[PDB]
From a paper:
hMPV F is a class I fusion glycoprotein, synthesized as an inactive precursor (F0) that needs to be cleaved to become fusion competent. Proteolytic cleavage generates two disulfide-linked subunits (F2 N-terminal to F1) that assemble into a homotrimer. Finally, the fusion (F) glycoprotein mediates fusion of the viral and cellular membranes to allow entry of the viral ribonucleoprotein into the cell cytoplasm and thus initiate a new infectious cycle. To initiate membrane fusion, hMPV F is activated by still ill-defined mechanisms leading to a series of stepwise conformational changes in the F protein that drive membrane fusion and result in hMPV F adopting a highly stable “postfusion” conformation.
In order to advance our understanding of hMPV F structure and antigenicity (which lags behind other paramyxoviruses), we engineered a homogeneous preparation of soluble hMPV F folded in its postfusion conformation. This process required genetic manipulations that were not necessary for other paramyxovirus F proteins. We also crystallized the stabilized hMPV F postfusion trimer and determined its structure by X-ray diffraction analysis. Refolding of this intermediate leads to merging of the viral and target membranes concurrently with the assembly of HRA and HRB sequences of the F1 subunit into a highly stable six-helix bundle (6HB), which is characteristic of the postfusion conformation. Indeed, we found that 101F binds to hMPV F and cross-neutralizes hMPV. The structure is similar to that of the related human respiratory syncytial virus (hRSV) F glycoprotein, and two neutralizing epitopes are particularly well conserved, thus providing a structural basis for the cross-neutralizing activity of several monoclonal antibodies. Although immunization of BALB/c mice with purified postfusion hMPV F induced very limited cross-binding and cross-neutralization with hRSV, the elicited sera had robust neutralizing activity against hMPV, indicating that the hMPV postfusion F protein may be an effective subunit vaccine antigen.
Residue numbers in the entry:
A (entry chain E), B (entry chain A), C (entry chain C): 19 to 91
D (entry chain B), F (entry chain F): 114 to 482
E (entry chain D): 115 to 483
Write the structure that this text describes.
Amino acid sequence: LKESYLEESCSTITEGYLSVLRTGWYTNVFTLEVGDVENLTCADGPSLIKTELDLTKSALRELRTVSADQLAR
Amino acid sequence: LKESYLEESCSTITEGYLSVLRTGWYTNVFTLEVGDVENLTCADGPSLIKTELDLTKSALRELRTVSADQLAR
Amino acid sequence: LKESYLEESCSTITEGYLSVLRTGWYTNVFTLEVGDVENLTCADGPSLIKTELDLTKSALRELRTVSADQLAR
Amino acid sequence: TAAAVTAGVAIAKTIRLESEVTAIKNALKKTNEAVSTLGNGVRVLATAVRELKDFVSKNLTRAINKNKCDIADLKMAVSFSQFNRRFLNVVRQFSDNAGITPAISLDLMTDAELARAVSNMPTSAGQIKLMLENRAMVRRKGFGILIGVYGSSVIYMVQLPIFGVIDTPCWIVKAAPSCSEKKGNYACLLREDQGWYCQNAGSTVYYPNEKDCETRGDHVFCDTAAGINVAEQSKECNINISTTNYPCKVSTGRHPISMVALSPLGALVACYKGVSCSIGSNRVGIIKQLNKGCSYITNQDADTVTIDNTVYQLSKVEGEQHVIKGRPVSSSFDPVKFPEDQFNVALDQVFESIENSQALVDQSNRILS
Amino acid sequence: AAAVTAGVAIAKTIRLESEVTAIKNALKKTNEAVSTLGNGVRVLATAVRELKDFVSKNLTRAINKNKCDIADLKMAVSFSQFNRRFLNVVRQFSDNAGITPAISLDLMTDAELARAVSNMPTSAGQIKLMLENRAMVRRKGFGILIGVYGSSVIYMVQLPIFGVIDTPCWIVKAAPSCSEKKGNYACLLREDQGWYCQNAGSTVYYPNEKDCETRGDHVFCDTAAGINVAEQSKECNINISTTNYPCKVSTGRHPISMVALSPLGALVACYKGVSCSIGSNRVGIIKQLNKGCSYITNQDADTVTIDNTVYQLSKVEGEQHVIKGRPVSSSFDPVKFPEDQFNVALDQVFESIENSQALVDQSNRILSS
Amino acid sequence: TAAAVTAGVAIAKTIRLESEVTAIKNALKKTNEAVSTLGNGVRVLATAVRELKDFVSKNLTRAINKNKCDIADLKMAVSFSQFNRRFLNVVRQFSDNAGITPAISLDLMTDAELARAVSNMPTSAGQIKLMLENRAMVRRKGFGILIGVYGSSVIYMVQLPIFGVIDTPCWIVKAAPSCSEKKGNYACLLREDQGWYCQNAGSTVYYPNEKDCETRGDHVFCDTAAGINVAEQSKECNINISTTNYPCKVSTGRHPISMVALSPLGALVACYKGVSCSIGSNRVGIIKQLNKGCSYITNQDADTVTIDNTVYQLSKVEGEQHVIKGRPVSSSFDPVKFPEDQFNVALDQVFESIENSQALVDQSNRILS
Ligand SMILES: *[C@@H]1O[C@H](CO[C@@H]2O[C@@H](C)[C@@H](O)[C@@H](O)[C@@H]2O)[C@@H](O[C@@H]2O[C@H](CO)[C@@H](O)[C@H](O)[C@H]2NC(C)=O)[C@H](O)[C@H]1NC(C)=O
Ligand SMILES: *[C@@H]1O[C@H](CO[C@@H]2O[C@@H](C)[C@@H](O)[C@@H](O)[C@@H]2O)[C@@H](O[C@@H]2O[C@H](CO)[C@@H](O)[C@H](O)[C@H]2NC(C)=O)[C@H](O)[C@H]1NC(C)=O
Ligand SMILES: *[C@@H]1O[C@H](CO[C@@H]2O[C@@H](C)[C@@H](O)[C@@H](O)[C@@H]2O)[C@@H](O)[C@H](O)[C@H]1NC(C)=O
Ligand SMILES: *[C@@H]1O[C@H](CO)[C@@H](O)[C@H](O)[C@H]1NC(C)=O
Ligand SMILES: *[C@@H]1O[C@H](CO)[C@@H](O)[C@H](O)[C@H]1NC(C)=O
Ligand SMILES: *[C@@H]1O[C@H](CO)[C@@H](O)[C@H](O)[C@H]1NC(C)=O
C-alpha cells in the first residue's frame, strides 16, 4: 500500500485498497427435522431418553414462540 | 402499504407503516439455583459426576468475575 | 453526582463522571489442542466415542474454512 | 459205606459253601471300593461346585456391582445436565458475551414468564396486545444483564422495552441526486430529509438511517436513541420542496452523480453523463434502457438495474432449498435368560436317584434280618 | 455213631446254606443302590456342568458386553469433559464465523486475563482500574480465529489498553427552547449534545449517548466515535451567546414538544397544543406542567406525559423469580449373595463323604479278619 | 470210620465258616451305611446346587438385564445428541438470539452448502471466486432468520451478501487540525473529508467512519447502508483543499487543538501551545520530541506517540502466547474371564470316577455270578 502525507491540509490519504461492494441478497431456506428414535420398552416410566425427548420437545415449543410468521404460533 | 414517487425532488415516500415506539424499560430479576445431587459413595474418587460438578463449580467461579456489582467478587 | 439545569438553553449538564479511554490494543495468542483419546477396540463398529471424535473432527474441518489466514485452508 | 454216602455229601456241600463265602468276601471287597470311588467323585464334584460359587459370589457380582455403580455414575452425570439445563444454558450465555446478553434468550426468560411480565407492564391494554404478538421483537429489542454469582446461585436481570406509543402514522423517505443541466453546467439537488419518519404527539420523530427502524409487516420498531425530533411541518417537503413554511433540508452540487437508491417497493435511478443505465428481468436480459435523468421503477416492474457493468438487485434472489434429517436412533437391548426347565427336571432326577438308592440299602438291611 | 455226625453236618450246613444266599441277595441289592446313586451323581454333575456352561459362556459374555458399553460411554462423557474449553471455544468461533463479540470466559480465563492486563504497557493505576472493571475489558475486546492446523485451534485475543483514566467527564442533553411574542415562534436548540471527556491538550466529544458506557462513575468511551473539540467549547454551558466559541445551535420557526431524558432527571418541552403532565407510578397525575421548558428530577416524579403518551423517567422494576432444578439421585442397588447358609451345606457335604469313607474302611477292616 | 472223619472235618469246617459269614454280615451292614451316608452328602449337594442356580437364574440375571437396560437407555440419550447435533445446535442459536442470527454460522449452513450457493449466485466468474475466497466475510456479512417451527421441523432462512462490484480502487482519509499562528492568535482549518472512499461506476462512494468498512488484506468490505454517493471530482480535495472545482468539506476554528490521529501506515500529530508532544518506542519513553505544528510519522518510525502524559500506541502490542492440551482420555475396560480349562479338568475327573465306581460294582456282580 502507499500512504501519502498531505502537508497542506494536515491529512493523510492511504490508497491501494480494492473494493468489495454488496449489490444484493441471495437466500437459501433450510428444513431441519429430528431423526426417528426407537421406543425403549425395556424400561418403565422415567427413562433418560424420554426425559431427553420431552426436553427437546419443549425446547421446540418455546422456540416456536419466536417464529417469523404469526401463523406458526 | 403505498409508495409515492415525487418527481420534482427525485425522492420517494412510502406510507402506510405503523409505529412501535419505546417509552421505557421494564425489568425482572431472576435467581437460578443448581439442583441437589446425592453423594455417590459407591465409587472411590474420580466419578464422572464429581468431575462434572467440580467443572460447573469452576464455571461459576469464573462467571463470578464479570458480575455487575463489585460486592459479589 | 451533580446535574445542573441551564434554563437559558433549555439544557442539562451532568458532571462528576470519570474517563476510561482506549489508547491501544494488547494481544495474546492461544493454541488449544484436543487431548489424546485411546482406541476402544473391545467393541465392534459404531462406538459412541468413535462417532464423538468423527464429530469433533468434522467440526474442525468446517471451522478451518473460516480461519483468518488463507494458508490454513 | 452207608454212612459215607451221607457223610461224603456234607463235606462236599461244605466245600461248595466255603468257596461261596470267599467269593462274596471278594465281591464285597470290590463293592466298597466302588462306594469309596463314587465318594471321591462327589468330593471332586463338590469342590467344583465350591469353585463355581466362589466365582459367581465373589469375582462375578464384583463385576456386576461395579458396572452397577458406573451405570449410576453416568445416569447422574447425564441427569444433572438434563435437570439443570436452564441454569447451564444461562451460565453459558453470560460467559460467551461476558456478563451481558444481546437478547432476552429463551433460556433467560421463558415464554410463560415473558408473557406474564408484558401483561404487568405499566401501559394501555392495546399496547400490551401488540407486544404479545411481536414478542420476538420485545426479546431482541430488550436484553439481559448478569448481576452476580452468589455462592452457587446465578442472579441476572432481563430488561424489556415498554412500547408506549403504537399504531401512529409512519413513513420513509428515499432520494437520489436530481441533477439538471443547461449548456454543460450541472445543477444538482439532493434531499437531506432522507430516512424514517414516525408521527408522534406534538412532534414528528425522524430517524436518519434505515437500519434505525426494524420492519416486521406494517409495523416499524424504531430505536429511541436514533430519533431526532422535527417539527411536523417538515412533512410538507413531500408536496412542495420549495415551501417557505419549512426549511426543507436540500444540498446543491455542481457535478453529476449516477446511482441507484432502493425503496421498499422500488428504486430511484440517476443516469447522467457517461453511464449505461438499463433495466433487466428474471429470464430475459434487457427490457428497457433508461433515459438520462431521474427514473423511478417498481419491484413489479423489474428485478434489475444495471449501471455500466454493475448489476443491482431490487429484491431478494431466491436460491436453493434444503432439507436435512438426522440419523435414526435405535435400541440395542438383548436380554439374557437361563433355560431353567431342562435343568429343573434333571435335579428332580437326582433327588429321585437318591431316593431309589436310599430305599435299596433298606431292602438290603431287611434281607439281612 | 458215624452216621449221627453226618446228619448234624448237613443240618448246620443247611442252616448256613440259606443264610449266605440271603447275604448274596443282600449284596446284589446294595450293588444296585450304588449303581443307582451313581446314575444320580452323574445326572447332578451334567446339570452342574450346564450351569457352568451358562455362567462361563452366556453370562460373563453379557457382563463383558455391558462392561464394554460402560467403558465406551465413560470415554464419550470424559472426552467432552476433559475438553470443555477446547469444545466451547470451537463452538463460539463457529456460531459467529471466525470472530467473537467479546473475550469470553472460555477464550481467556480470569487468571490469563489478569496476567495480561498486568503486563500491559501502562501505569500502576491504569492496570488497577482495568483489573477492577475487567468485565468491560472483555466486552470492549474481541477474539479472532487465526487458523485450524490439523487438530489444533490457534486464535488471538485482542484487549483494550485503557491508558487514559480518571479525567473529568460530563454529558449534555437539551430540548428545543421555543420563545413566543405575538403568536410567532422563535426556537433555538443546542446541537452540542453528547458525551465530553477531557484529555491532555484537548476535549473529546462523543456525539451519541450510546458511544460511552456507564459503570458507576466511570465512563468507557469508544475511541472511534470520538471527535476532538477546543477546550473552550465547555463555555457553552454558561452563556450560549458566548463569542469565545462558535456555539453549535440550531434555530427554528416551529414549536417542538418533547421529552429528553437526563441521567438524574428529564427536560420537558410543552408548547402549543399538548397536555404535558407529571405523574407517578403509585399516584396517577401529580402536576400539569406550564408551557415552556421544564426540568424535573428522577426523584421529583416517575413519569412525564405528553397528551396520551406516557414517558418513563426510570426503569420499572417488575416481578422477581427464583428457580431450582430437579434433584439428581443415585440408583445404586448392589446385589449380594446369601453365602453363610450355603457354605454350611458344603461342609455338610464334605463330612458325609468322609463319614461314608470312614465306613468303607471299617467294612474292609472287618473283612481283613 | 472214614465217614466219621470226613463228616468230622465237615462239621469242624462249618464252625470256621460261621465266623467268616458273621464278619461278612457285619461288614455289609457297614457298607450299606456308607452308601446311605454318601447319599445324604449328594442330596445336600443337590439342594446346595439348586440354590446356586436360583441365584444365577433369578437374582443375578435380573441385575444384569437391568444394567443391560440402563446401558441401552444411556446409549440412546447420547446417540440422540450425536445423530442430531446440527438440529440441536441450530435450535440452540435461534434461542440464544430469539429468532435471528448475527452471522451465518457453521451449523446454519455447512461449507459445502455455502460454496454451492455462492457458485449459484447471479454474478460474474471473478466475483464468485472472490466470494469463495473470503467466505468467512460472506458468512459474517450475512445472517439467519427463523421462519417457523412446524411440528417437529425447524424451518429457517440464510441470507447471503452478493458481492457484484469488486476490485475497484479504494482509499481512506485521515486528518488532524492544521493550525497556523500569526502574532499570538491561532487560525485553524480541519478537513471533514475523513473516511472511506470507494470508486464505483458513475460515482464515488464515501463511508464516513473507519468502522463502516472492514479490511481483510487489500480488500475493503463496505457497508452499503453507510455509503454516501459523492462526485468523482471530490478526489481533487487531496491535492488542493482550496480548489474551486469541488466544494471541499473543511471547517475552520479560532482555537488550537492538539491531538493524535492514527493512519493505516502511520499517525498524524498536532502539537500546539502548551503541550509536550513526543514520539516514543516500546522500551524507551522518548526518542524524539515533536515540533509544534502538524507532524506525520510512520509505524516504522516509532511505536508510540505521547501527548503530555497520555501515551498513544501506533501498533497492536504483542503479549504472551499460550498453548493448552486437554487431559488424556483413557479406557476403563477390564473384562472378566472364567477359568474353564481348570474347571473342566475337575468335571472330567468326576465323570471318570462315576464310570470307575460303576465299573467296580460290575466286577462285583461278575464275582457273584
Ligand atoms: C483404531 O482401531 C481400529 C481397529 O484395529 C483393529 O483391531 C485390533 C484389536 C487389532 O485386531 C488390529 O490389528 C486391527 O487393525 C483400527 O484399524 C482399522 O481396522 C480395520 C478392521 O478392524 C482394518 O481393516 C483397517 O485397515 C484399520 N484402519 C486403518 C486406517 O488401518 C483403526 O485404524 C484405529 N484408529 C486409529 C485412529 O488409530
Ligand atoms: C411550490 O411552492 C413555491 C412557493 O410557494 C410556497 O407555498 C405557498 C402555499 C405559499 O405559502 C408561498 O408563500 C410559499 O412560498 C411556488 O413558487 C413561488 O411562489 C411564490 C409565492 O410566494 C411566487 O411569488 C413565485 O412566483 C413562485 N415561483 C414560481 C417559479 O412560480 C411554486 O409555484 C410551488 N410549486 C408547485 C408545483 O405548486
Ligand atoms: C490551490 O488552488 C488555488 C486556485 O484554485 C483553483 O485550483 C485549480 C485546481 C483550478 O481549479 C483553478 O482554476 C482554480 O483557480 C490557487 O490559487 C492556489 O495557489 C493553489 N494552492 C496550491 C498550494 O497549489
Ligand atoms: C478372582 O478373585 C480373586 C480375589 O477375590 C483373585 O485373586 C483371582 O485372581 C480372581 N480370578 C479371576 C479369574 O478373576
Ligand atoms: C448361549 O450361547 C450359545 C453360544 O455358546 C448359543 O448357541 C445359545 O443359543 C445361547 N443360549 C442362551 C440361553 O443364552
Ligand atoms: C433375591 O430375590 C428374591 C426374590 O426372587 C428376594 O426376595 C431376595 O431378597 C433377593 N435377594 C437379594 C440379595 O437381592
